[PDB]
Amino acid sequence: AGGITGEYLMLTYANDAKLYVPVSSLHLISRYAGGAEENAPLHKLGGDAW
Amino acid sequence: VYSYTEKKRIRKDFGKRPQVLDVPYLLSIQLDSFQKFIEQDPEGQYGLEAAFRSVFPIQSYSGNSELQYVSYRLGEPVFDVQECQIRGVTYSAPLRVKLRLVIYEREAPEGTVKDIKEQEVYMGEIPLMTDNGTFVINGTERVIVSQLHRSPGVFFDSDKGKTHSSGKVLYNARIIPYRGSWLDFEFDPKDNLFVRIDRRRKLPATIILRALNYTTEQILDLFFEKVIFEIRDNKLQMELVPERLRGETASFDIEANGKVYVEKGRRITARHIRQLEKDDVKLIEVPVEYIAGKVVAKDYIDESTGELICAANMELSLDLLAKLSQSGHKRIETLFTNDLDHGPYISETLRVDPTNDRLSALVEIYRMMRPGEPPTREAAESLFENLFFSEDRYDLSAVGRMKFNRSLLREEIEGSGILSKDDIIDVMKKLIDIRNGKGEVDDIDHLGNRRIRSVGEMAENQFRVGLVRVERAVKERLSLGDLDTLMPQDMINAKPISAAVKEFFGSSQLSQFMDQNNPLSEITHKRRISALGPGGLTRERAGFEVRDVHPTHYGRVCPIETPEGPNIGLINSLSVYAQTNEYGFLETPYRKVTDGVVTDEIHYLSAIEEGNYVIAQANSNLDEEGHFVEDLVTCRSKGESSLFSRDQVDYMDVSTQQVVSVGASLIPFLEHDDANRALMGANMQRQAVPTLRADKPLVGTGMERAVAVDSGVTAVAKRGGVVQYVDASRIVIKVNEDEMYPGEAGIDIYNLTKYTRSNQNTCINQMPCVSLGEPVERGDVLADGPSTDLGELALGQNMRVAFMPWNGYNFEDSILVSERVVQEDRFTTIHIQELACVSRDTKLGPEEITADIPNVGEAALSKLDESGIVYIGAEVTGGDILVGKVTPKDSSLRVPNGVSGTVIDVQVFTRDGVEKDKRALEIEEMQLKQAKKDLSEELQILEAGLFSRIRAVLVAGGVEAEKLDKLPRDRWLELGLTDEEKQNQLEQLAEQYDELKHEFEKKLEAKRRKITQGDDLAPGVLKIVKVYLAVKRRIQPGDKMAGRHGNKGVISKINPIEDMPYDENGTPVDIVLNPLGVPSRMNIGQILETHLGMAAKGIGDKINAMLKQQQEVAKLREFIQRAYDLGADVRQKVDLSTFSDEEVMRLAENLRKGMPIATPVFDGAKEAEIKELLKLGDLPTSGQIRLYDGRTGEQFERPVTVGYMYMLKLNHLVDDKMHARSTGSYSLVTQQPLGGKAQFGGQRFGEMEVWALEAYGAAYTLQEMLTVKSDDVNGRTKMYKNIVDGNHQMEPGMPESFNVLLKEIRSLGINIELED
RNA sequence: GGAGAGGUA
Ligand SMILES: [Mg+2]
């Protein structure tokens, strides 16, 4: 991270756009609530409206 | 010892040196540079990794986030090379980069992370280099020629006394960065050191010296030696080092220690310094007149009042000395000066300097860089700090740092990329040292100072120049806030990157069009070393000296291949074995010689390192143990040949032919010609048109095979095997069992490029030179390209030449030519032209390509189809219609005036959204059928390969030959076999077959999506149609055909076969040259080549006669053995005892037209071997036979030279030059005829051509010449009416281009008029 | 029409 090595969590989204999040900020992470754990959709993270 | 393919026809190699190093890949410079460009670099020094690590990571201005970089990956090209070639688009790779954006937390301190995102994002299409070295940019193959420019570093120099009206030399020093601002120091004629940045206004160097946080005391410490002055009670006991006394004048009683050493009136001798140093004397009692005008070093201020007594750098006087001695100062520090060895050049520049403190220096510099702009304190320090000492706006690369340290006699190869204080101090120190007398300045033409900048480096610099813009935009928008939902596709924009790549590869100063009318022309164009370009000199601003050959050029740059005309020696070519360095300098290989034996290890010596050692000549007689057989051998030590000892040498030359280029080393007997005429020959060789039937050169130089295979024109086998299917169009190679891969077993297919258009309107084809079922090795040619024969270069034909003057039909340089050479159809060449018709959008709407053209009959439309396009294969002549077109009110394409031809291909492209006519659908459907045929034929031939592999691995482990074919070839797994790793091989083969099943069903439909797509075009055009015409330009009076030693000549009469000189056996000579061009133009190489060709076809006629009547293979074997023997210790030594008695007959068929002879360049065939070879033949050994005349039938006394000289037809055909005009169209602003031949243009009666008519009495001719025939628009129509009415009479008038002058003078503030 | 490059004498 510019001279500071950190442990992050790679969560992949749609169009395989990766997203690494800090382990300390773990409370921004939750399990699926749609109940489609084998068929959940894949959000475009940033957004398709651009 | 010899391969099967080279047993087909083996060239007799003369020459005596053993080769210790083969000629390398001839295109290795381009391939190595571009594979340093696009290839993943782990260390991060070469290629896109270097530029990305230079620029990325990019911070924001606020610093709340930054964009970093992970890796890059080139996409698969959307089209391959030949489809990009047809369509008219770049052969390009998309660049997909893994960018990574952090997000910091705001209220958290500097360095914390909210979030980080990563994706593969695209920027820019980069063109890929093709398999040979060319870039396909818009369907025109272009080559980026290498540059030869100023190596960054520091260069000391002196304009040799031709300035200042004095004869005084003015040394100067350039600090040349790789990228950034140059720095110049120079001496005034009055010994004042000056600086300038970027050749702006000159300043003294003390301003840039004080701007580095320096004051005057520090400077006079730095540049100068100290002399101590100790005022004591008794008359100025001064501390004097005796080494400062040498060469100087005595000025008083030099008496010390109670001893009179030196009287006045002496020059201070050696023995006086000797007695001062044995007497150990450190102080001399001197009078105070020795401070007549000397300078104090530092500030001296009072100890009690604390006031200034004398300033630093002030010339002391006796009152000043009194003030110093009265203030309690004992040490007086003076700068040591000297007439020769210590000039005080810094002190007067401090005197000239109007700056006393640092802010004054910075204000002066900020004024000097940007005049105007009233200076502020922060801007000046910022400007000077980013001018030289920032990693962004200044950069001496590793090459710059190498040259910078190696110049100053430092040690380290690496250091800071930017300048440092110590560096600039060293530059002033060394420059003043040169001015004092020690040290030495450089010569700028030395190849230690000139550096090859090839295609990878220039493209990387252009890509970085683009990347600086996009990081700037990213920095702008990233410094714009609310980054929380943002992704790195809208911050980066591919348009600046694609612009800065597309401009350079598309239209640059060194991105030039491929000279593609040979294999040789393209392979000598990819090796070209241009000194032009950005960062280099220009054609009309180049002196006599840079054009000249420097003696450093030996082995790096060829000295005899060079274009003639305005740029001599700016367009140098590489030598044969020469390499580029790690850094870029030109290095040449040399054999290492030990104490007395020439070894075989070779070192690639650079340019600077060539001077330090001593290197032998190329042809030094060594004999079987590495010993130089003489004692006085010729070497070069420091740019000077001399006879040195047997036992002083350091290196040996790798070959006799390492001096010359590859374009020049094909010249046989090059050691006999001139260098002027050999320059004309080796430059002339690159324009030989590919003839109809390529014929091998009888006298080659052994580099013919290397050029014809290193050029990518011959289709060469990748893996050896047995050929299984030869067509006229494709080659099927079954791979041998040892070369076969386990995964992707298969076979090999080659598709041969048929009659397509080379870049200068000649044809290239590939004829297969192998018949069915033949063993092929790796690296073997299979398909001959244009003007190649069995994988050796064959640019022209080889025919019978007799050197007699023949009745004035070959007067100056002309070439009398028998009609047998056109009857044999051996110089008539194909020329394939391209004619395109647009479908524009104009006012009153678009126009059609329909057949209904006004005012034409069935004579015009008799060749067209219904849809407006001529039939493929229709022969047309001039003035015809190939494509019909209309205007909304006749804008049809026509064949241009004078040419013939057969239409061989028609390509229609249509823009997307416009309906395609029935012709376009017809072309599309045979295109789709042919593509389905290609993919299905590949699939089923590869299916035959897979099933043959399966049957090959079914010969053991469960063999039932009948059960192979009970069930068909589709299911060859479920028959009887033992389930082991054999079955694992069959299961790998089965999934490979199913993989090909998938690949066919997707690749055919992908090809459909490519074909059916109506392509992009220019904005405005609906459909473009491009017909390809093909002509056979035969030969005629007027053409220019030449030799290989530059005896160019215009063929002047196709003489009938009967009239030609014929020998007593009756064979008529094909070409009768002129002997007169030999004693002046010193090309005796053509006479020896003629003699050697005559010997070669003497052996050819003996083998042909021995085969015509049937004689056994034992006669052929011994005769060919004797022929390949007979050298005076030659090196070839081919053994026919191992030839299997069909290969002798296969070789003897190929020698029935004359044995090829190889003569290496400077290891040539001597005259004695030629006499022995002629004596082996039944020919007279003097070379000259008795010819009879064709007409008189009598004997020419003084019998004449005949032979077989290798003649090229140059690409200046007379039908492309001959031009005429009576009256066509006219130019717009001036009513004069247009120029050129593309427009129907008349010639230019120029200024020197008007003085010739003034020089006669001729005036009315001149008056009609520049009024009526050209510009008097009232008068040129009346003239035309006057001829057609049969009355030659002129109305002179007044030319309208004089009225143009009147308007363009009167349009200033100048009145100009005509009087009464 | 203008640049850029290469070529011929
Ligand atoms: Mg001429």
Side-chain angles (χ1 to χ4, degrees), chain A residues 1-36 38-47 49, chain B residues 1-42 44-109 111-163 165-1316:
Chain A
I4 298 96
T5 310
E7 199 76 27
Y8 294 82
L9 187 153
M10 183 278 287
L11 172 43
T12 185
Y13 275 75
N15 296 315
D16 49 288
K18 306 317 174 284
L19 183 62
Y20 308 86
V21 293
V23 62
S24 296
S25 183
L26 165 65
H27 47 75
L28 280 72
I29 296 89
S30 309
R31 213 162 40 79
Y32 196 34
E38 66 271 16
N39 293 313
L42 280 186
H43 278 134
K44 293 179 179 179
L45 177 63
Chain B
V1 65
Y2 273 109
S3 71
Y4 183 79
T5 179
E6 202 65 29
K7 287 183 183 183
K8 294 180 91 167
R9 173 196 63 218
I10 182 158
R11 194 169 283 273
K12 185 192 188 304
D13 193 70
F14 274 117
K16 285 88 176 174
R17 317 291 156 181
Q19 282 67 59
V20 298
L21 160 72
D22 45 358
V23 57
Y25 199 54
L26 281 175
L27 304 174
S28 60
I29 181 168
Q30 298 272 310
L31 271 296
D32 291 331
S33 303
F34 212 69
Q35 302 313 72
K36 299 315 215 72
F37 185 63
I38 60 170
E39 193 168 359
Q40 283 83 3
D41 181 21
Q45 49 201 4
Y46 284 134
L48 300 180
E49 310 269 17
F52 281 140
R53 281 181 177 86
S54 71
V55 174
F56 292 88
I58 191 66
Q59 301 300 114
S60 85
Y61 268 169
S62 59
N64 54 4
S65 55
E66 60 91 13
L67 182 63
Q68 65 182 177
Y69 154 77
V70 180
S71 175
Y72 75 102
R73 157 183 83 94
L74 282 72
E76 179 84 67
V78 292
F79 315 107
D80 51 349
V81 298
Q82 69 275 17
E83 295 170 355
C84 283
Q85 183 59 3
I86 294 301
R87 210 176 326 282
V89 71
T90 64
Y91 173 68
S92 65
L95 184 65
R96 308 244 172 224
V97 63
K98 312 274 204 320
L99 287 185
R100 201 175 278 176
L101 182 63
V102 302
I103 293 170
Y104 303 154
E105 208 285 336
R106 310 199 296 136
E107 289 88 345
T112 41
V113 169
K114 287 182 177 179
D115 195 13
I116 184 170
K117 338 178 180 177
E118 188 267 358
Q119 65 182 357
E120 207 174 41
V121 59
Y122 160 74
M123 61 215 288
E125 279 317 292
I126 47 165
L128 304 94
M129 182 155 88
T130 48
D131 302 278
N132 309 323
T134 80
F135 296 90
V136 190
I137 297 301
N138 274 319
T140 65
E141 274 183 284
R142 322 167 76 88
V143 175
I144 317 294
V145 296
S146 298
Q147 205 176 234
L148 181 79
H149 73 113
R150 301 284 296 277
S151 54
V154 58
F155 283 169
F156 315 123
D157 189 358
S158 74
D159 45 347
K160 37 188 68 64
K162 65 172 188 176
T163 188
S165 89
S166 306
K168 187 191 187 46
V169 291
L170 274 71
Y171 302 96
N172 73 323
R174 303 261 201 71
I175 297 169
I176 311 166
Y178 188 90
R179 169 180 56 95
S181 298
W182 302 29
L183 188 58
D184 198 323
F185 302 97
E186 70 275 16
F187 286 95
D188 190 282
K190 295 303 298 198
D191 290 327
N192 279 329
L193 208 61
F194 288 111
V195 73
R196 41 162 79 181
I197 295 173
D198 292 331
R199 303 302 279 229
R200 302 285 256 278
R201 190 195 317 102
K202 174 213 63 62
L203 279 187
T206 72
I207 296 89
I208 191 167
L209 196 42
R210 280 170 177 271
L212 315 172
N213 298 317
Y214 283 167
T215 187
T216 303
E217 297 183 352
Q218 296 171 352
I219 305 312
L220 305 181
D221 291 331
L222 276 177
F223 284 82
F224 287 124
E225 293 180 352
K226 301 299 204 185
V227 178
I228 304 295
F229 275 75
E230 304 114 307
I231 298 188
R232 304 182 162 277
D233 217 355
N234 204 49
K235 289 287 289 144
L236 196 57
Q237 190 77 222
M238 182 277 288
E239 195 269 330
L240 180 79
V241 169
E243 277 76 21
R244 306 208 165 92
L245 282 157
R246 62 172 178 89
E248 290 292 329
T249 309
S251 65
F252 58 91
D253 301 336
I254 309 187
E255 184 253 340
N257 300 16
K259 299 214 285 194
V260 179
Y261 293 86
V262 176
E263 68 160 305
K264 67 165 293 301
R266 292 280 210 274
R267 74 82 181 181
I268 307 306
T269 72
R271 78 176 311 128
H272 289 297
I273 312 162
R274 290 173 78 254
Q275 72 190 231
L276 270 293
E277 63 204 300
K278 56 184 220 164
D279 283 283
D280 292 331
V281 194
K282 289 175 264 309
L283 300 96
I284 320 294
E285 205 164 61
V286 301
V288 194
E289 196 73 8
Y290 183 76
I291 303 300
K294 310 306 171 301
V295 61
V296 62
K298 50 201 316 185
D299 276 330
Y300 281 147
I301 59 171
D302 209 316
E303 302 297 323
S304 85
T305 57
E307 285 145 31
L308 176 62
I309 320 169
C310 65
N313 189 359
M314 202 75 98
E315 285 182 350
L316 291 175
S317 277
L318 298 175
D319 195 3
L320 283 72
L321 279 163
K323 288 151 202 167
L324 267 297
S325 51
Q326 88 189 339
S327 295
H329 302 291
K330 319 299 298 180
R331 288 310 184 262
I332 297 89
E333 188 36 74
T334 54
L335 310 178
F336 167 61
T337 65
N338 176 276
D339 60 359
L340 275 74
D341 270 28
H342 281 242
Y345 314 109
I346 298 299
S347 310
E348 290 89 7
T349 54
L350 271 299
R351 291 185 179 276
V352 168
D353 195 4
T355 71
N356 284 37
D357 52 351
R358 181 177 182 268
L359 179 59
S360 195
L362 294 175
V363 161
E364 284 260 0
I365 278 176
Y366 179 80
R367 179 66 66 192
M368 183 278 288
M369 281 325 269
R370 284 203 300 269
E373 305 290 278
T376 62
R377 184 201 56 60
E378 69 275 16
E381 57 184 2
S382 68
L383 182 63
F384 188 78
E385 273 288 344
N386 64 7
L387 206 51
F388 289 85
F389 318 101
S390 75
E391 261 186 300
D392 291 331
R393 305 285 296 286
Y394 188 88
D395 173 272
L396 245 95
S397 296
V399 179
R401 183 52 78 172
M402 182 267 256
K403 277 302 291 175
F404 196 87
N405 310 322
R406 193 60 30 71
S407 75
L408 295 173
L409 277 296
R410 299 137 62 83
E411 307 98 308
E412 292 87 3
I413 297 169
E414 306 304 312
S416 45
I418 74 187
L419 268 188
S420 52
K421 277 74 69 177
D422 315 314
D423 287 359
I424 321 180
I425 301 299
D426 291 331
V427 175
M428 270 146 277
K429 269 207 178 67
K430 185 90 185 303
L431 171 63
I432 297 169
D433 283 6
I434 297 169
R435 174 55 182 79
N436 285 354
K438 72 180 183 65
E440 175 56 10
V441 295
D442 291 331
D443 47 338
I444 196 66
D445 307 340
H446 199 273
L447 274 296
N449 303 8
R450 289 149 80 74
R451 172 179 184 268
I452 293 295
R453 199 189 323 172
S454 177
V455 61
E457 182 166 340
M458 301 147 85
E460 171 183 282
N461 270 0
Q462 291 295 318
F463 179 82
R464 183 172 296 157
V465 160
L467 203 68
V468 169
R469 323 289 177 74
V470 63
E471 61 85 20
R472 206 279 301 289
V474 161
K475 181 266 289 181
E476 288 286 324
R477 187 183 91 91
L478 183 63
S479 302
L480 193 57
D482 190 74
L483 295 174
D484 61 358
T485 177
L486 277 296
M487 294 296 172
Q489 302 84 320
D490 62 358
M491 51 204 87
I492 62 170
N493 182 213
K495 314 153 181 213
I497 299 299
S498 66
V501 176
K502 214 163 171 43
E503 181 280 347
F504 163 67
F505 275 105
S507 176
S508 174
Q509 177 56 242
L510 292 185
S511 163
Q512 56 200 68
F513 204 76
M514 198 152 71
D515 279 32
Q516 214 193 325
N517 52 5
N518 265 318
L520 162 65
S521 167
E522 66 183 2
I523 191 166
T524 194
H525 189 279
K526 300 166 188 176
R527 298 170 54 86
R528 207 89 180 149
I529 301 302
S530 176
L532 293 166
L537 72 165
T538 47
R539 288 177 300 276
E540 61 268 65
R541 297 284 75 78
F544 292 108
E545 191 64 37
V546 56
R547 291 191 147 88
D548 199 355
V549 54
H550 202 275
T552 304
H553 285 40
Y554 186 95
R556 304 138 177 84
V557 169
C558 167
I560 63 170
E561 172 151 286
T562 292
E564 271 156 311
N567 49 3
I568 303 295
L570 314 179
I571 302 299
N572 286 99
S573 177
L574 280 186
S575 166
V576 166
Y577 299 91
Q579 269 197 341
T580 185
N581 216 359
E582 200 169 328
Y583 302 170
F585 302 96
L586 275 162
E587 59 173 20
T588 180
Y590 290 126
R591 297 165 85 169
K592 177 54 155 66
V593 176
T594 51
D595 62 358
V597 175
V598 177
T599 70
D600 305 331
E601 55 190 6
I602 62 170
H603 300 101
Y604 279 68
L605 273 299
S606 168
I608 304 171
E609 320 171 27
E610 202 186 15
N612 297 323
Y613 304 87
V614 62
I615 305 105
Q617 200 167 254
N619 57 5
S620 295
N621 290 114
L622 59 85
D623 61 357
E624 288 323 289
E625 267 175 22
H627 296 67
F628 291 72
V629 74
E630 295 88 6
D631 191 286
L632 277 297
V633 296
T634 303
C635 298
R636 62 185 189 277
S637 66
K638 296 181 184 293
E640 266 278 350
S641 63
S642 186
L643 282 176
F644 291 150
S645 70
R646 173 177 148 161
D647 199 359
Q648 273 167 349
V649 308
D650 291 331
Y651 287 96
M652 181 54 207
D653 292 331
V654 293
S655 179
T656 61
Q657 55 184 274
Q658 77 154 345
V659 54
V660 297
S661 45
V662 66
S665 86
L666 296 189
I667 286 179
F669 295 112
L670 172 44
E671 83 265 41
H672 297 254
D673 299 78
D674 204 1
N676 213 6
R677 191 55 57 184
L679 193 148
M680 290 204 207
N683 189 359
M684 185 179 289
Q685 197 146 290
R686 302 160 46 199
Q687 296 156 9
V689 74
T691 65
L692 206 52
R693 253 180 298 112
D695 193 297
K696 54 178 168 63
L698 297 187
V699 185
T701 65
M703 181 95 58
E704 279 82 8
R705 182 133 54 95
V707 177
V709 69
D710 286 32
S711 173
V713 297
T714 64
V716 61
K718 312 191 301 308
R719 292 195 311 280
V722 173
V723 63
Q724 195 264 330
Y725 171 66
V726 182
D727 207 14
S729 162
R730 75 158 48 85
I731 293 301
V732 173
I733 292 287
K734 202 198 182 319
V735 191
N736 268 318
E737 298 317 294
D738 64 299
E739 298 179 356
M740 182 85 108
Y741 292 166
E744 191 36 81
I747 54 174
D748 271 303
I749 188 167
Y750 303 116
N751 286 316
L752 302 198
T753 313
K754 291 324 279 198
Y755 290 135
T756 180
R757 164 171 180 300
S758 66
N759 198 3
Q760 291 103 50
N761 284 346
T762 52
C763 83
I764 70 165
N765 60 4
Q766 311 213 48
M767 311 156 258
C769 64
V770 289
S771 298
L772 288 172
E774 287 182 349
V776 58
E777 287 89 309
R778 187 181 212 284
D780 185 13
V781 293
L782 312 170
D784 279 292
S787 87
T788 54
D789 208 7
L790 283 157
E792 60 186 336
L793 196 64
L795 301 93
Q797 310 287 328
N798 52 4
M799 68 193 88
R800 197 172 176 88
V801 175
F803 284 89
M804 67 179 43
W806 203 86
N807 196 116
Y809 272 100
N810 63 7
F811 173 64
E812 201 86 340
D813 273 28
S814 312
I815 296 180
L816 174 82
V817 158
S818 171
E819 184 178 1
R820 270 260 280 270
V821 67
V822 61
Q823 266 179 21
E824 281 160 337
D825 199 8
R826 66 192 307 175
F827 268 122
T828 70
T829 56
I830 308 171
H831 281 86
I832 305 192
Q833 321 196 46
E834 190 190 68
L835 278 76
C837 184
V838 304
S839 63
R840 278 308 312 156
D841 278 330
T842 181
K843 270 75 180 171
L844 294 174
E847 66 271 12
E848 298 97 299
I849 316 299
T850 60
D852 292 28
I853 306 292
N855 277 4
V856 298
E858 293 293 328
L861 308 181
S862 44
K863 302 178 189 296
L864 282 84
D865 77 327
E866 55 87 20
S867 166
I869 296 89
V870 65
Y871 287 152
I872 292 170
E875 51 264 16
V876 305
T877 78
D880 205 348
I881 297 89
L882 309 173
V883 171
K885 210 179 80 173
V886 288
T887 187
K889 289 177 72 68
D890 207 321
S891 179
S892 53
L893 181 138
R894 326 288 188 131
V895 169
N897 290 318
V899 295
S900 165
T902 313
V903 174
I904 62 170
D905 194 7
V906 170
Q907 295 300 108
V908 287
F909 311 136
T910 54
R911 201 184 69 245
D912 206 338
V914 178
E915 66 99 19
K916 308 171 187 178
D917 47 17
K918 305 197 62 75
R919 179 75 165 173
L921 277 296
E922 173 184 335
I923 295 173
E924 275 176 345
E925 67 173 328
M926 72 203 88
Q927 183 61 256
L928 267 171
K929 190 263 209 174
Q930 186 52 279
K932 187 176 80 70
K933 180 134 156 184
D934 288 2
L935 270 74
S936 59
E937 181 72 26
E938 187 268 334
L939 183 63
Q940 74 191 264
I941 288 288
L942 200 56
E943 272 177 352
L946 266 174
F947 293 152
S948 301
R949 189 67 174 170
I950 285 173
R951 198 186 283 144
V953 304
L954 274 158
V955 73
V959 60
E960 312 92 6
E962 287 84 359
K963 200 167 189 279
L964 304 172
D965 300 328
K966 301 177 118 190
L967 208 52
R969 46 179 73 244
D970 47 353
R971 187 47 61 204
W972 278 16
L973 294 183
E974 301 191 62
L975 74 163
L977 189 152
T978 73
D979 194 3
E980 58 197 323
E981 193 172 0
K982 284 214 182 187
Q983 184 66 25
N984 193 89
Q985 184 52 274
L986 277 72
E987 193 175 2
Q988 214 285 316
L989 292 195
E991 281 296 327
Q992 177 176 349
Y993 169 81
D994 184 51
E995 178 143 19
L996 288 160
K997 177 67 181 295
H998 307 186
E999 291 312 310
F1000 175 76
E1001 87 191 284
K1002 63 181 84 90
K1003 195 180 298 315
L1004 188 152
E1005 57 88 20
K1007 179 46 141 193
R1008 188 174 264 89
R1009 303 290 320 102
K1010 294 181 176 66
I1011 293 172
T1012 61
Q1013 177 53 56
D1015 56 353
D1016 71 314
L1017 287 179
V1021 62
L1022 282 72
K1023 62 201 294 181
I1024 188 76
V1025 64
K1026 291 183 174 175
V1027 297
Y1028 284 71
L1029 199 50
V1031 298
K1032 275 210 286 171
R1033 315 197 169 285
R1034 285 151 47 227
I1035 197 164
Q1036 51 211 302
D1039 291 331
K1040 170 180 196 187
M1041 71 154 47
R1044 271 182 306 178
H1045 319 108
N1047 47 358
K1048 57 207 176 180
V1050 172
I1051 176 176
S1052 71
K1053 194 204 181 189
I1054 301 299
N1055 220 5
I1057 173 177
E1058 299 86 7
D1059 289 15
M1060 303 295 307
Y1062 67 102
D1063 49 354
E1064 182 169 37
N1065 210 124
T1067 55
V1069 161
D1070 308 348
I1071 289 174
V1072 176
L1073 288 184
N1074 199 21
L1076 267 54
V1078 190
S1080 176
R1081 314 167 175 87
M1082 312 295 198
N1083 44 67
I1084 311 297
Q1086 82 178 315
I1087 299 182
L1088 280 74
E1089 200 276 339
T1090 293
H1091 286 329
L1092 192 58
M1094 187 65 204
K1097 264 214 175 180
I1099 313 297
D1101 194 10
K1102 291 199 48 59
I1103 290 182
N1104 184 57
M1106 163 176 308
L1107 293 175
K1108 185 193 303 315
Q1109 60 183 1
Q1110 291 278 28
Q1111 292 198 23
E1112 53 266 358
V1113 286
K1115 302 285 184 68
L1116 277 298
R1117 179 176 316 267
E1118 61 86 20
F1119 177 69
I1120 292 173
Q1121 192 47 63
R1122 186 151 86 264
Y1124 278 97
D1125 284 324
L1126 62 80
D1129 195 0
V1130 293
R1131 195 202 61 279
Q1132 171 64 210
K1133 286 169 66 179
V1134 66
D1135 198 0
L1136 289 169
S1137 86
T1138 68
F1139 274 57
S1140 58
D1141 208 7
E1142 277 89 5
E1143 318 173 285
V1144 170
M1145 284 323 265
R1146 204 162 29 105
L1147 191 139
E1149 190 276 331
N1150 286 331
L1151 295 182
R1152 83 186 315 170
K1153 306 226 293 187
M1155 157 160 45
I1157 299 181
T1159 304
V1161 177
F1162 288 106
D1163 189 359
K1166 297 178 177 66
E1167 293 87 308
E1169 292 144 319
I1170 284 167
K1171 309 301 203 64
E1172 299 205 331
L1173 191 40
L1174 277 169
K1175 186 183 287 185
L1176 165 66
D1178 297 340
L1179 283 72
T1181 185
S1182 185
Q1184 312 183 184
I1185 62 170
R1186 280 181 42 242
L1187 294 175
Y1188 304 119
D1189 204 330
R1191 302 164 309 173
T1192 69
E1194 271 275 89
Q1195 200 261 359
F1196 301 92
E1197 51 275 50
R1198 312 206 73 258
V1200 300
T1201 295
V1202 307
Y1204 277 86
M1205 184 177 177
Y1206 186 69
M1207 281 286 198
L1208 311 175
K1209 185 174 88 172
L1210 302 194
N1211 189 179
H1212 308 292
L1213 277 299
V1214 71
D1215 62 27
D1216 273 332
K1217 297 291 184 67
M1218 183 278 288
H1219 183 38
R1221 169 178 181 170
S1222 78
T1223 295
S1225 53
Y1226 289 103
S1227 189
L1228 207 71
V1229 55
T1230 187
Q1231 283 278 348
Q1232 296 175 7
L1234 311 93
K1237 187 179 68 67
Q1239 316 94 333
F1240 202 77
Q1243 261 59 63
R1244 170 155 165 81
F1245 206 74
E1247 195 177 4
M1248 312 186 108
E1249 294 179 354
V1250 171
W1251 306 331
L1253 283 195
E1254 318 191 13
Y1256 294 124
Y1260 283 103
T1261 290
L1262 179 74
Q1263 176 184 226
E1264 76 170 5
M1265 198 77 70
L1266 62 80
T1267 72
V1268 176
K1269 274 200 256 170
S1270 71
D1271 187 74
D1272 199 79
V1273 58
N1274 189 359
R1276 69 193 181 195
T1277 67
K1278 271 297 306 177
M1279 184 63 73
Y1280 183 76
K1281 276 165 205 184
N1282 281 8
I1283 295 90
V1284 68
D1285 293 338
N1287 164 52
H1288 309 330
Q1289 172 183 352
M1290 65 180 288
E1291 271 199 42
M1294 210 273 277
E1296 280 289 336
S1297 67
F1298 186 46
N1299 288 112
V1300 169
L1301 177 70
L1302 282 183
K1303 299 298 167 303
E1304 308 212 23
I1305 297 169
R1306 213 180 294 190
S1307 169
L1308 279 76
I1310 307 281
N1311 187 5
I1312 174 168
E1313 61 173 355
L1314 304 176
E1315 287 288 317
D1316 54 312

